[PDB]
Amino acid sequence: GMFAQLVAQNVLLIDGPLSWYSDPGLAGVGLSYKEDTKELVVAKAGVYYVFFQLELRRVVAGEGSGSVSLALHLQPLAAALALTVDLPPASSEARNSAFGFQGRLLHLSAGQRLGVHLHTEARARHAWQLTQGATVLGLFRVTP
Amino acid sequence: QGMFAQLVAQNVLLIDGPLSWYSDPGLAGVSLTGGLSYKEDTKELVVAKAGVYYVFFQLELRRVVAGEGSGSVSLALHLQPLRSAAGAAALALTVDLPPASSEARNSAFGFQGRLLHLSAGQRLGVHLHTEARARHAWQLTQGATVLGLFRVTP
Amino acid sequence: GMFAQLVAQNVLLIDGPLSWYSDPGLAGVSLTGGLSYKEDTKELVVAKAGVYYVFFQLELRRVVAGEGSGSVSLALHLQPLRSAAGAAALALTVDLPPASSEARNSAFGFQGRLLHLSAGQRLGVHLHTEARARHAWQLTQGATVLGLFRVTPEI
């Protein structure tokens, strides 16, 4: 009931909620993630510092332009955390990567279910992807 | 007690000066006091108990008239009254306003976090400075300019 | 308390490991815990093991008008690798746009994760750059920092 960090399984840019798996870099050490409805549920009530980050890679040279948003929602049914990252159009000496980070203090009641939904608005949507192991959701409590 | 805090600015217009703050309504309704009090007259945020804290603020803008808007806006957190020799801020943040274009976004976001040593009663002020042409074209989006901290020592 | 924060000495972008000094903004309490900085290896060693919230940041400024184009990367390495995990524990690349009409003249980046640090692990940061006019930018001094603190100290 102290902290939790997990990584997204998704790679392709498709609108909808992301499935996650526990951070393998944190294995050798009390919040749960239901695999069916892809929700992280908080065990103990408290004020947590919740944060996610998102890195994107361009996979097709010379294609892809738009933006990609990532919203965390108190579930069930604005968003608590909101992160939209820009995808630059392709050119010589243009970036092939993009990143965004955001953290905030959220009050989460005991049993509150969290959900993160990925939205994209981009021409040639297939030209960008989520880098494996780089879009992370984490949180830890600061007040019992 | 946990001794935490988080506020969000009432300011929208890009006008140089200190920001007005109010407590996070999403945290209104927690038992702990939250060791940080916003005094309304001087637009300062005094810290209750001394200690070491992770302090962060974020900034988000929207372009509110299409076509214009170019430059940057900066957020500066100063321990007040100023008692340093360099005059630098304890926390700074600069986000840039992209000019209007086809296939160009109408948002800007920035986030920065550090560890501060704030003594008991220390007053903090957050100042906004813009170096932007046609700055009336962008504003701080409602509820997005946030400042928060929490203590990392008992 | 088990926490630490470092400020980089470097301003000129050369590829290699950044050299640090303890953030004066916390001098009233020093570097409480057991975390110490080793100048010869430019690494910060971890005393008490456990899970930490780690973060670095990075701000660059164009210091020659009309020049400078590319991208710089910042990488945190955990030495030695624990369970083959430690290389690029935190990675962060930010681009430096070409100078042009109303173009960006500064660039910033932030990242923060929960890492499980072992007792005796060294933390190093490497700055790698890919720029056409490498000198036209540089690291704003005092702005590229690396800090951390513990949430739980289970071995």
Author numbering:
A (entry chain C): 90 to 118, 123 to 170, 176 to 242
B (entry chain A): 89 to 242
C (entry chain B): 90 to 244
Sentences from the paper on this structure:
4-1BB is not expressed on naive T cells but is rapidly upregulated after T-cell receptor engagement with cognate MHC:peptide complex expressed on antigen presenting cells. The 4-1BB binding partner, 4-1BBL, is a type II membrane protein of the TNF superfamily. The two leading molecules in the clinic are utomilumab (PF-05082566) and urelumab (BMS-663513).
SEC-MALS data showed that soluble 4-1BBL was trimeric in solution. Much like previously solved structures of TNFSF ligands, 4-1BBL adopts the jelly-roll fold typical of the TNF homology domain, with the inner and outer sheets of the beta sandwich consisting of anti-parallel beta strands A′AHCF and B′BGDE, respectively. While the structural jelly-roll fold of the protein core is well conserved between all three protomers, differences in conformation, discontinuous density and elevated B-factors can be seen in ligand loops A′B′ and DE suggesting a high degree of flexibility in the absence of a binding partner (inset). Comparison with our receptor-bound structure showed that the 4-1BBL trimer does in fact retain the overall bell-shaped arrangement in the absence of receptor. Specifically, the A′B′ loops in the ligand-only structure show varying degrees of disorder and variation between all three protomers. Hence, we believe our 4-1BBL structure represents the native unbound structure given its agreement with 4-1BB/4-1BBL complex as well as other structures of the TNFSF members either alone or in complex with their respective receptors.
